[PDB]
Amino acid sequence: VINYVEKAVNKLTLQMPYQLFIGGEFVDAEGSKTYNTINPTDGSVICQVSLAQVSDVDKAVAAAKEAFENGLWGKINARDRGRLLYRLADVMEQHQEELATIEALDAGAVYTLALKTHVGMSIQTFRYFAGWCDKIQGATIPINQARPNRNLTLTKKEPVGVCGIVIPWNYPLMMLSWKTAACLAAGNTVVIKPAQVTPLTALKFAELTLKAGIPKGVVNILPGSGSLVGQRLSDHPDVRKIGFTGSTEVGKHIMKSCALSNVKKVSLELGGKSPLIIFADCDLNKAVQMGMSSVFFNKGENSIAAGRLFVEESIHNQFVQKVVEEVEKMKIGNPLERDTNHGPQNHEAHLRKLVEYCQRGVKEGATLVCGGNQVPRPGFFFQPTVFTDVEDHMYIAKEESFGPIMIISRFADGDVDAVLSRANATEFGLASGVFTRDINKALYVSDKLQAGTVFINTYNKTDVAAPFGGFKQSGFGKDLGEAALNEYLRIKTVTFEY
Amino acid sequence: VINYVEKAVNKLTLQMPYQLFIGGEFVDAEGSKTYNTINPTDGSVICQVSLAQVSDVDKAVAAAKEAFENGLWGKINARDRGRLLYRLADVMEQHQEELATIEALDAGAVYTLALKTHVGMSIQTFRYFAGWCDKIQGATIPINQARPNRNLTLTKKEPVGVCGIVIPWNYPLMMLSWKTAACLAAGNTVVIKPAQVTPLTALKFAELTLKAGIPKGVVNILPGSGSLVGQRLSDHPDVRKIGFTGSTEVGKHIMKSCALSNVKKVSLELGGKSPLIIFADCDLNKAVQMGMSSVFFNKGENSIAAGRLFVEESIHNQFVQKVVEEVEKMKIGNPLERDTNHGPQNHEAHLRKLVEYCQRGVKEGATLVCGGNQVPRPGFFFQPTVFTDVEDHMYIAKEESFGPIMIISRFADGDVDAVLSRANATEFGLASGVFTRDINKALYVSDKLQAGTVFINTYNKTDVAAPFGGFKQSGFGKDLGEAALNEYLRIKTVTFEY
Amino acid sequence: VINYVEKAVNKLTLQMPYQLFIGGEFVDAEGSKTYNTINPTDGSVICQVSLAQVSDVDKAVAAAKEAFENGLWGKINARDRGRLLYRLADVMEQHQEELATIEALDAGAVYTLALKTHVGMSIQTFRYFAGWCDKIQGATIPINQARPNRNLTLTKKEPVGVCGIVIPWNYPLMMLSWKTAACLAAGNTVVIKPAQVTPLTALKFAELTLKAGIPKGVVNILPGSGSLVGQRLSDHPDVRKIGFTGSTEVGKHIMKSCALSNVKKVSLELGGKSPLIIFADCDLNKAVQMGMSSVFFNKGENSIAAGRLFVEESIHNQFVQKVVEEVEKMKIGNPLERDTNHGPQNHEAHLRKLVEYCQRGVKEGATLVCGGNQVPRPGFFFQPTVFTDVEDHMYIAKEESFGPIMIISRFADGDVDAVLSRANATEFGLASGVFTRDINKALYVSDKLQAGTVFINTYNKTDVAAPFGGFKQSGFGKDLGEAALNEYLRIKTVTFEY
Amino acid sequence: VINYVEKAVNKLTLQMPYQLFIGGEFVDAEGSKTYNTINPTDGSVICQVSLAQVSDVDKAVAAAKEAFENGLWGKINARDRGRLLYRLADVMEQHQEELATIEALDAGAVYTLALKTHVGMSIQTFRYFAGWCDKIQGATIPINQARPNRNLTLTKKEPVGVCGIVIPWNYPLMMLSWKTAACLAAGNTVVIKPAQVTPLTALKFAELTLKAGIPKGVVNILPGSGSLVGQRLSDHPDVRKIGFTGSTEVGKHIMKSCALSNVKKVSLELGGKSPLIIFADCDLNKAVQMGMSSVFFNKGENSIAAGRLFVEESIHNQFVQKVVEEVEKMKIGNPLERDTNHGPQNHEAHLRKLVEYCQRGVKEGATLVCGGNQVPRPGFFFQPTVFTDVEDHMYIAKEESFGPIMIISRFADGDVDAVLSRANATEFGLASGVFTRDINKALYVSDKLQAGTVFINTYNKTDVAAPFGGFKQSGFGKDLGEAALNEYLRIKTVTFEY
Numbered sequence A, B, C, D: 001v002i003n004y005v006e007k008a009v010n011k012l013t014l015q016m017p018y019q020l021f022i023g024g025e026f027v028d029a030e031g032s033k034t035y036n037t038i039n040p041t042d043g044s045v046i047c048q049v050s051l052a053q054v055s056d057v058d059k060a061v062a063a064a065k066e067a068f069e070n071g072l073w074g075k076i077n078a079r080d081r082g083r084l085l086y087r088l089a090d091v092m093e094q095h096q097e098e099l100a101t102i103e104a105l106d107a108g109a110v111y112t113l114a115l116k117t118h119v120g121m122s123i124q125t126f127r128y129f130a131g132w133c134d135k136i137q138g139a140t141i142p143i144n145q146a147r148p149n150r151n152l153t154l155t156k157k158e159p160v161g162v163c164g165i166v167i168p169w170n171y172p173l174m175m176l177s178w179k180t181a182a183c184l185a186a187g188n189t190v191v192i193k194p195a196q197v198t199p200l201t202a203l204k205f206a207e208l209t210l211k212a213g214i215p216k217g218v219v220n221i222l223p224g225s226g227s228l229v230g231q232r233l234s235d236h237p238d239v240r241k242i243g244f245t246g247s248t249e250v251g252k253h254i255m256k257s258c259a260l261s262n263v264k265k266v267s268l269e270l271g272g273k274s275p276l277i278i279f280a281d282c283d284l285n286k287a288v289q290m291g292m293s294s295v296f297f298n299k300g301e302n303s304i305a306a307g308r309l310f311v312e313e314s315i316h317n318q319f320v321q322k323v324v325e326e327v328e329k330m331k332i333g334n335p336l337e338r339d340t341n342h343g344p345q346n347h348e349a350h351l352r353k354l355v356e357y358c359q360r361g362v363k364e365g366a367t368l369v370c371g372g373n374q375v376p377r378p379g380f381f382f383q384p385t386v387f388t389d390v391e392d393h394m395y396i397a398k399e400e401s402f403g404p405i406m407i408i409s410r411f412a413d414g415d416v417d418a419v420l421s422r423a424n425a426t427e428f429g430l431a432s433g434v435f436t437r438d439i440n441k442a443l444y445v446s447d448k449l450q451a452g453t454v455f456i457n458t459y460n461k462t463d464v465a466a467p468f469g470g471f472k473q474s475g476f477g478k479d480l481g482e483a484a485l486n487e488y489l490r491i492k493t494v495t496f497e498y
């Protein structure tokens, strides 16, 4: 029997494992270390989770390795691997109300949105990649012949081996799903550091793999400190690929950790400060509604959030005036109310960091139209914020706030290259939008945006089949899509003479 | 006018440029520093070559930037870009006796060989990758439509931009070509740091790009030090991809450097203690001749050289008795004589380490069948070496010689799983091979060998179209082949709603 | 509510629908016409099946048309489409025993093999292609720009639309699944003529598509005669693609009809006289077992069946002596019994054909070493046959038997080139194989063989991810693999200028 | 030495061969027959060209057959076959003035434009496919392993063998090139029937292969009658692929011929009544210039020409008004004079149909805005014609003009679905186009147009890398693009077990 933290809430009776997941069992940490996970809706302790120690990493990696080298996962057909990864999705469906609720407590996600996006996309991801298994192909190549003999060259795509996946707190299960699916589909096995503050969905997922008959020790999950658990993963000489999603500063440290250990492969999806340019000739009402989502989605905690909205001179004051009308209607409150539009922030820390961010923007001149402060009420809620009169040199114009904060800069009518320019003025390069009814501006601003993803007359429409990565300092590699896979496969050329 | 360094040799008149090639003109380095390049056939100073400084990297990098961002290379058609790259091929072809010589002279490549391989394969690289120019395609993906609307998702394959290429000395021009061609074909501008000790053929190529009509600033060559020029490239906040081929130790360092500045893309292609398994049932004549080749080609100064030979017991003795016979037939001598077929080592530095290598080899009680000394003549000649009785734990079964030192071990008659286990016991995995007539043995071995290439009844069968790379700590990323372009490309995802 | 011919057998209760399936429901044919389907084991009547009429092919085709044009099937995201195709696979699994049981009864397929291949490989198909749904991808081509302007060129893969699938009697459900999967996965809609003589699995599967949620009229099955109902599909001006699998002289007639009606795409999987060449250097025990499989598999009613065994002289007599031994052991009898390995032939008609094929084989002087007669038991049982001293000119050497008749020819010890030649000497080109332990002989033979599959050291190993097609008068196009989708897609090029 | 018909024009000495090209040499017809090819600028007999007879096809085929099976074409590297075609591209470029001249003489193509397009794109086409030669890769596929053993599945792409090409008269050289290039590049050898009326550029190319070193037999050109030389190709037992571009009527016929012959692979590029929908919010002035070229380009002898111009109401009057002012500015006249916009039609018989077309036009109720008559000057010039008030039942809405005949219909304001549906109301579907400034329209429409190409805000913007092909009765299969290779390759699946 797996040990649960049992909690009756939201018409369910949650059974949450709270332990380490190493080789198929749920165990205590070395020395039975533990920490609390905080419910950000009221700031209470949810329960206590195992605190993975360095020994524990080594143990996890050793399980995964064995499980890849001699374990069932390594021997089965590509096709049958898919079968399991579909089952895995399937189980995840059958538990979705649960998973979403957990996520609702643990990360403060709105339970309706947790359902559709956090859990939904998750379920979707596994299904997608599941499909890619008997479809990962190599080539035969027309190598010059070494006459009077013949030659055949072929490639094989092989797994890379033991992987470490290290992820942040904004969409706990979702992130975990994105990479792990790609990882497991490519035939690898894995140790997962979920963000320390958000362990619960990750662990429940652990259990689910069991129910899916994921072979013992292909998946391993270790709640715990990045500085320690995550650090070992990168240093460990038996792991051979890191998948990372996190802050720029750590990503830099990670890549470094990888080079100094054993030149492991590494993928980075770091920050964004993505510009959304809204033209006067767009659909002004859809632009307020799309562009609010481009900031407020998942309480702002989001990689592709629009860091800046650039708005044609002619439509600006009316766009703002409209956004404030809409913002006043946004329902703040507990994630478990079907009611709620806007939930609480992920953990205290980040609310305090959001508080200062906004102090600071006001300090340096920008106009604070609304919000910019904690919502006074228990738990850690933050008022949707709108800044205007934001200028290119400002902190708030350069820095990734990662919270419900609209940053609006006007762009003078009928230059394009001149705003394009200001939008590519960052070292971030992850996402970007353009709203216009004009085909030419769209197609053009779409080449010129120095960013991995360009939304056109929409926002936040990632999909599990379209590749997702960064340029410049947003990192490299892709998540989701056929091209998320090359991160987790390797290519062997085989040359015969005959 | 260009400053040449004329030299009458091999029935030709070399005119060898010898300065930094920045901004598409040849220039002196900061404050006119220079250094000597040495002929490894008589230890003489060939001529003086410019010593690029930090101030010079900075210009070269910012000359490549301008050349991408505002220059003609940034705007011509993709089909037209590749047209320029083919031109370059035939310019290089028309300079093939001249180029095979500068190589013979500068890196001690046997002349017939430089012509065929150093320079000939360099030519085919460019023809090959100019072909890919307008065949680099993106995709359109069947994204989930956001009813009641529609979406369109596509990927554009864009250039990365300003690239650093840092190469070694063993095939000065070919390693330059393999990497440059891909990069330039994907549409990038480059700064190239050749191996300090082999700046000649790179500089000539520098001239030849002017001849082709490559726009000024696309191609930039800085002869100099790895610890100064090399390092600045990887630190530069404006370089975005570092392609690298060299030592494991240096490799590890580059990645860390890349990590630390601006998360720049990196592809390492490092050492290789590559195993060749020879079963009782191959053509034993071919086995020898081919296995010889797998060690002695280009004075064994070759990333993929068979680092070990494992010869099945039943034929071990007779294979060694055959290899020796063949080694004696080898004519050692000056790269430019027609009758020569084993030239000198690249430079003093290295010939010294090779000496030390076999020393240690004998110290550890592996038995020396022949060679292992510096041939007594002037220059840097190393004698074709054979070891036998090399046990797995020994130094000379672990580190990389990169000199013509055939290193032979026994495996027991009708083992397979064990020889393999032995052959894979290295932290390298770049190349490997197996001679055998048993389709089953053949295909299984090539499954199981933990290495980027597996030759099968052949060796040193690289082809511009077959991807060349490393697993484990031999690195990551591919050179040559379609898959190479991946390292010089980025994917932008465009998601339209409508 | 549906009408079933209900039958208690094989530890279950068959409930087979016996009607045309048209646009959602099961209806009787024009003025209630019907025919008999004959159980091949005892010769009995299984039941009455509706006999579709020209009037009905029209009913069906236009059902499919609506279903494609404003019907739900062509609106659902590509991904949800795969979901339905996956659910249909789950349902087929759920009903697998029933389905094999009908297949056994209807086509006389040994029930163990039917489970694994007929039903098994069918269930595998619909899953394999279900996965391809949201991974069918277009491209962005980097087209020459029309300076001073800019262009973008993309492709979209799209459905061809209403399709006709016309299939034979040897693997009724399987032939249907192979093609229908592909068809449905590319998002078409479809009318199907199963072979008149075997309509039953076909119609069951229709019921199954209802269980699945496949929407009304996406699939329609019309049991009926080729020369009426099929001739109609191939003439119909609203069908835009035909996938045929059948005889040659009928293949030709279809293409001819497709030309004349509306230049509808056609794809043909026709005859075979597939050569299998057996060298003395193989595992000769594994070669009788693999080589009787090549002919006998599913009673020799099997397009890639080895129509012709060339056996190297030195092992010829011992190969025959051994087959003969293994042929005695084969248990002939009721498909539904556990111990039976050789089933009855599909229908009375085809049986007489084989009796005569073998008469005619003796007449020209081939040496009936065993078999050639019908088995003295009720129903339609045919003696596994073996012929030797069979010459390149003989009828049985040239013509396609489609039955359990191994046709053995000697070739000369040493020859490779001269046998290869007599095995390519055919206007057929569907399969071929080679047994040999020698990697050289093996790759070289598979180059030189003129056929769309070459089996090396194995045979009859088809699989859903690997494409299956003919060369020469065996036809063209692919069944299975990613490449069968190309026949069920079209390509629109979109070039913008902007 | 080759006989020419030498002629001095355009400050040039054309040497034009006029004989059958068969087996790498220029030879006479059987019993030396010939016929006259007729300059359309004035009507003069340009010269007597050879008239290929049936035994002349048997020879051409059998040449290409030897040339493929034993010839150098299929023993050389894929990389070298490539070289040979790049070289041929340069021989074309060196001869481009002459070739563009011959074209303007033989098929009356404005020389200004013959150079840039007829010849320029031919030259680009050979350089395109040349670079595809060594990049036609196969696959390795994750086959289900037959445990306890193992399996390996690869695909080789091989050439199809001897092909026939049959072309129309409108871009004699460019068509020959679109096809011949991709065919030869796929590794095939060919027999090409130029349109009877235009042998001249095809024969010079025939000679040009000789200069370029194309192995004797690889390219065979035979001018003659469609129903004699044409037919015998499509009938011949040794031809395996027929690539054809022409009338739908002939197309149906050729398909049927391939059917009765030997199920030779075919690929039709038939007619087209290509619709162009021009919204009211487009750039008006540009839409004119574009829209006019949509029809008038290359005297309208271009199969993707807009055969229908739906012009939104609010602007239809102003548009016709503008289109007229610009027609007046076009200069009719000798193709050879630099100042000429609109040259003659290809031959008498076509001009006669053109006159009858607009005869039937005015007759039915069309408003003839301008033109519709043969220009009064010698030769075959046809006045650029505009009609309006063209209703949907009119014969000029349904048939293919293939001349300079703009055919304009009104549509209601803001009324997309309706005009769409009008535009799709054809059995053709070769091209379409939309001029609009609004992205949602532009994209929507390009979904819904039932055609193989959709130009958006441009037209006649084909490109050697973008695939070109028709839907419905405009045929199937693509020319140009990677796409195009699929027509000239076969896929061999090779499945090992080991």
Ligand SMILES: NC(=O)C1=CN([C@@H]2O[C@H](COP(=O)(O)OP(=O)(O)OC[C@H]3O[C@@H](n4cnc5c(N)ncnc54)[C@H](OP(=O)(O)O)[C@@H]3O)[C@@H](O)[C@H]2O)C=CC1
Pocket: D166, D167, D168, D169, D170, D193, D194, D195, D196, D197, D224, D225, D226, D227, D228, D229, D230, D231, D232, D234, D245, D246, D247, D248, D250, D251, D253, D254, D269, D270, D271, D272, D302, D303, D400, D402, D430, D470, D474
């Ligand atoms: N979609 C596309 O790729 C393109 C299509 N086209 C189409 O081409 C057409 C113009 O050609 P048009 O001359 O009117 O008609 P055709 O189709 O008859 O002309 C094409 C060719 O067919 C030949 N031919 C006639 N009968 C046979 C036969 N039995 N077997 C083999 N070949 C035969 C003709 O020979 P002969 O010289 O004796 O007539 C000619 O070479 C237009 O309808 C246009 O739409 C044009 C360009 C591109």
